[PDB]
Amino acid sequence: MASKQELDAALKKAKELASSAPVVVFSKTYCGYCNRVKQLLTQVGASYKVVELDELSDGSQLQSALAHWTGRGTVPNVFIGGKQIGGCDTVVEKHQRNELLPLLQDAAATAKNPAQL
């Protein structure tokens, strides 16, 4: 087929995407949960990138690489500081625990404090 090499190429693409900003949100164009993560990050004033997989030129294989890499091929799938965190429920819980804020300040994603928590 080719899918071992293309999954590895999509993994390399996903790693680079996940490292292109201090916060990255692998997502899709319509999901209420993807909107929730965007709104959550926006409200805390985090700087973030989004990868709406449904519009991405290799979206399905990129999502397959996310599934292979994280064991969590669902969306949204969120990364901070180039490390996978979880998804919507994870970031909402960490925000309610006021644990997402320290992590975002440490990633310097939230411009509130450019010098880490």
Binding-site residues, in ranges, read 28, 31, 75, 88-89
Q: For the chain, what is the largest distance between any 2 Cα atoms, rounded to a whole number of angstroms?
A: 49
Count of C-beta atoms within a 10 Å radius of residue 2: 8
Q: How far apart are CA 14 and CA 8, in angstroms?
A: 10
Which DSSP symbol is given to 72? -
CA torsion sign for 4, 10, 13, 17 is negative
Extract the annotated binding site for glutathione. Answer: 28, 75, 88-89
Q: Which residues are annotated as a binding site for [2Fe-2S] cluster?
A: 31
